[PDB]
Amino acid sequence: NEVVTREYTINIHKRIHGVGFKKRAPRALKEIRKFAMKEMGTPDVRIDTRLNKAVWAKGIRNVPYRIRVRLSRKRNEDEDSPNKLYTLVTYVPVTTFKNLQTVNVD
Amino acid sequence: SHRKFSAPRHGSLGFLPRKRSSRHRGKVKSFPKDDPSKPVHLTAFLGYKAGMTHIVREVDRPGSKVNKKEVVEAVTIVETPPMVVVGIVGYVETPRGLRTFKTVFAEHISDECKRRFYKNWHKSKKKAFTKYCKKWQDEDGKKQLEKDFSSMKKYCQVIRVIAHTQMRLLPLRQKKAHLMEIQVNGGTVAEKLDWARERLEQQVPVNQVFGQDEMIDVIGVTKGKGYKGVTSRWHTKKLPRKTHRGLRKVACIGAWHPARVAFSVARAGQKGYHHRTEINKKIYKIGQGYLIKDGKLIKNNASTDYDLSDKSINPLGGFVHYGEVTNDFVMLKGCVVGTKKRVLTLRKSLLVQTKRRALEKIDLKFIDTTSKFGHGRFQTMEEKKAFMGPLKKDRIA
RNA sequence: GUGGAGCCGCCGCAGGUGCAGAUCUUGGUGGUAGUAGCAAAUAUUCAAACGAGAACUUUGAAGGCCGAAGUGGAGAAGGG
RNA sequence: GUGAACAGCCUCUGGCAUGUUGGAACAAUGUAGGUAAGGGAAGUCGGCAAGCCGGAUCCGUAACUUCGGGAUAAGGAUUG
RNA sequence: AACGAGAUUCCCACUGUCCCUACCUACUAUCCAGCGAAACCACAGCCAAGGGAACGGGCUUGGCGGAAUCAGCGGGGAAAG
RNA sequence: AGGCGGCCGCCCCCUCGCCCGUCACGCACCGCACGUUCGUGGGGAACCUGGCGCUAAACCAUUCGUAGACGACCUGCUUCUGGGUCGGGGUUUCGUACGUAGCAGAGCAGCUCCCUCGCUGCGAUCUAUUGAAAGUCAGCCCUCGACACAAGGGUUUGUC
């Protein structure tokens, strides 16, 4: 039940592969969800709108090969589910992915 | 009636239940039948194929046009770390066949045998053979464990050896040893049993079992191709283009009056992943892999008398989908049953032969270790950056 | 045992007088079977809101199609 | 916009949610679209089907003829 | 002569029509959530021979004969219409 | 298909463990069937019950991709040679990135030091940086650099 926040590179080129042209960027957002419900640990994965714009910025079938995201574990409120934590995955733009590894922002 | 044009059967009816085999490890259906006049030895050995390369050799063959010339040959290589003997089995001959008399396992058993005795090593309490190892040490169990050898010596007449592989020395993921059960073909059954009491829980290398330019069998499970149709599983001819409801089908599958489809007809199902035995594969080289650290790591594989270059048989870029061979190997002329990383059991041939292709001495001249992960054109990393020169790789000093 | 207002024996009388069939007539129910199927015209995604409840509603954002002989704007017959 | 063009293809105004469902997988057989070494009708009742050729500019065009044609004959060269 | 979505024969060019097949793509088939029919049906459903309305699934004599099922398949049901 | 058998040493014990003869009684149930054995057979279920012993493993979920239509199959999941994600290398594919620099550039325009390489601008390309850039396991190879993560579940299974 932490409040931690890390940032990550997701190469989508490994993670959607052999997918047909019209199911290619829509899977690229449920593989970000499957990444984020694996690592922060909670099923309620939220992603913001400016990351939906980030993956879809080149049509469906040409997803950018790698994106830089950050995952924020936060807790919920107001007559909540038996899941009481949610993850906000928001989009951080960057210019180079070389020698960028999983750091822990505080 | 009477096809007007003769043509033979498609496919063989001797492999007819084209079925997924019930085993991943190839089963020796028949070890070589012995006489006790020979010295004592093993007959079979487990190995893992890594991939293929090719070779160049000065082939000696009088009469042929191949004589005294260089001729390339496809070769597979099989990574074989030494086995480790665990058990002794005894088989008594009956009028119903062989029957296991009893087994004796080793005094203390490795990690990777014990992992083969479970379906979930994680959830297990790791408890197999824990009460069996305590009859080697108590006074009462020890005198009736060596009584089970003296009763083995009296009655049963063919004895075998349970040995497993050392998966720790291998680049795979598996870490379960493959537990084989292989027949000793020595002299009398007292010397045949004392040769295995001497050497429980000890290593048996691959050069002790096989020899160079000697011809063996290969037993394994084939590449699995899945559920495939009539024209691919059975190589049946396609129908013409104009055919309604389909091209890749066999058209007639029987006459009227046998009112019943036959086993001899071709129809769709599982293709591949079948248990097969290739016969008469010649060993080209017994490898020795990555020895002592006095000279820090002598690679020295694939370095023939005509090469004299510090090479190693693992190709430039590594074996594709396999890893990197750090152990002993046996390389075999030609194609071999199985995917890469698949357990295949090498075995001395039953039949004797002369044939002038067996018993010939092969002397290598060249093994390429070029990149199989593309159209590679260099053979060592020293050779490339001599030709390629400096790059933008270092670019700091 | 259910049921809740009619019913039967004998002597005579009189028939629209007794079903297994007619690819019978009408009504009902199976098995096939949770099966065939819900595949013509490129495509959906994120967040939010109202709600017991959202792949489909709405709203914003992105990505697409029609592409002015239109999937646009109005009519005639027809509908009501 | 391209172009000879109310062709085709792409966009703006204006419309729409992919045409009575969604998810996962990517076996056979199919339906629809490609590609194939060497040979080039040997396939077949039959060159069926598919593929070649294709626009425009500069030349150059036979037999035959009802003198009109054939004729974009055929056969080349070029193209940013 | 000209013109034929007319019939035919040859030649050039071209090509998976063929030698001789192989691989890739979409939509399915396939599995799941929901929804869900119809033709058909004496009883049913493993064979060999015999006899028989002369070509049995049942009958005679033999062979033999384990639940429950899935994706296919086109021999049979002298399959359905 | 030994599951059965032989021998011996000590021991609570018998001295009738047989045949012939003597003496005399026990349900003699009053004519009657399923009597008499194997046998404290086999199987199941629980109770009162002394002693000696034992403290698991399957399947699902998750993972893998040597496997697969679906099931099935091959594997991983230790609190550190555990394997997962990023990063780095290796391998390889295509063919030299953007930007900057140029006395490279068919020429053309302007200005004036009217200027026989005067200067500047426009300009496909070309040269240098640049065997560069970009991709690379998703079913490539080696990593043990950095981040975490792991015992967290679910369903059942016993031999009078």
Ligand SMILES: [Mg+2]
């Ligand atoms: Mg045998």
Ligand SMILES: [Mg+2]
């Ligand atoms: Mg063949």
